[PDB]
Enzyme design. Sequence first.
Site, mmCIF file in Angstrom:
data_model
loop_
_atom_site.group_PDB
_atom_site.id
_atom_site.type_symbol
_atom_site.label_atom_id
_atom_site.label_comp_id
_atom_site.label_asym_id
_atom_site.label_seq_id
_atom_site.Cartn_x
_atom_site.Cartn_y
_atom_site.Cartn_z
ATOM 1 N N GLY A 16 0.816 -1.196 0.000
ATOM 2 C CA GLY A 16 0.000 0.000 0.000
ATOM 3 C C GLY A 16 0.854 1.252 0.000
ATOM 4 O O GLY A 16 2.052 1.219 0.289
ATOM 5 N N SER A 17 0.208 2.365 -0.336
ATOM 6 C CA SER A 17 0.876 3.661 -0.381
ATOM 7 C C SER A 17 0.059 4.725 0.345
ATOM 8 O O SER A 17 0.216 5.920 0.095
ATOM 9 C CB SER A 17 1.120 4.090 -1.829
ATOM 10 O OG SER A 17 -0.098 4.172 -2.548
ATOM 11 N N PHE A 19 2.296 9.738 2.569
ATOM 12 C CA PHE A 19 3.243 9.889 3.670
ATOM 13 C C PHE A 19 4.171 8.685 3.766
ATOM 14 O O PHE A 19 5.391 8.838 3.899
ATOM 15 C CB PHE A 19 2.491 10.099 4.985
ATOM 16 N N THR A 21 4.696 4.120 2.805
ATOM 17 C CA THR A 21 4.335 2.900 2.099
ATOM 18 C C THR A 21 4.671 1.689 2.957
ATOM 19 O O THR A 21 5.640 1.702 3.723
ATOM 20 C CB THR A 21 5.060 2.797 0.750
ATOM 21 O OG1 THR A 21 6.470 2.944 0.952
ATOM 22 C CG2 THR A 21 4.576 3.883 -0.199
ATOM 23 N N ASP A 125 -10.279 5.952 14.552
ATOM 24 C CA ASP A 125 -10.921 5.453 13.340
ATOM 25 C C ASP A 125 -11.076 3.942 13.467
ATOM 26 O O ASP A 125 -10.160 3.185 13.135
ATOM 27 C CB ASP A 125 -10.124 5.834 12.100
ATOM 28 C CG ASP A 125 -10.918 5.654 10.829
ATOM 29 O OD1 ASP A 125 -12.160 5.537 10.912
ATOM 30 O OD2 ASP A 125 -10.302 5.634 9.744
#
Length: 249
Positions: A16-17, A19, A21, A125
């Site tokens: 994922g990527s 700010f 990765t 979250d």
Amino acid sequence: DWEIPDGQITVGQRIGSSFGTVYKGKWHGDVAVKMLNAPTPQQLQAFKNEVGVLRKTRHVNILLFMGYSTKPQLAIVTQWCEGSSLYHHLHASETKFEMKKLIDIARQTARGMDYLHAKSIIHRDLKSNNIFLHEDNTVKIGDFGSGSILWMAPEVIRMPYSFQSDVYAFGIVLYELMTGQLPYSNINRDQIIEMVGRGSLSPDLSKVRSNCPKRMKRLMAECLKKKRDERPSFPRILAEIEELARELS
Ligand SMILES: CC(C)n1nc(C#Cc2cccc3cc(-c4cccc(C(F)(F)F)c4)ncc23)c2c(N)ncnc21
């Protein structure tokens, strides 16, 4: 104290990527590495806080924090989880769960969240995306990340973040588990925000599956209470689920 010297970590495939990765890595076995890269002051601050919070956590249903690296680049290494998140299983894979597994999932998520709140830790979250199923039986709670309005409580929509906001987010996950579909399915996004924020809108409990226990629906409704103080604490709801899970056995 938990710093991994350079050269030990072997970075592999990218997952994922902006700010940072994350990559799958090998450090005494399968591990996940979240790397940085200019590092923003806020990004450096979040890196410090994540290490500070994670080191204080030692729970099975909380993502195991193995260490942090600084020399090549700022990175945090965690256990490697095999499987997919709860959001993918329910809404993307179209796989129906047995009710025993569903209550077990809610039971396991309740344990980790209660553990976090017991440590005065707020998971701001919390949603089905942030619940990962290691293998397929053990749930791991982490920060696998506007996109999560559906889980936001009325007060956080209006303006805030607290234990009461977290238990509300737990309620939507209960709604997702029992119903098998995202809340506010009928509705568009601005309409949901205004209606939920003003209190006009609430998830449709009738859509729940027939096999759902009566106590779960009542417990689910209690978590979704509009009044923040009305919501029960995580010690109470963990005891309720585990007592219900014990009865079902
Ligand atoms: C879905 C897929 C792409 N992905 N992303 C994985 C990962 C990762 C992390 C790496 C380094 C630090 C982290 C810190 C946190 C964090 C931060 C604050 C609070 C909390 C808490 F409060 F919620 F606990 C957790 N979460 C996750 C990572 C991952 C994995 N480790 N295994 C399999 N797939 C994975």
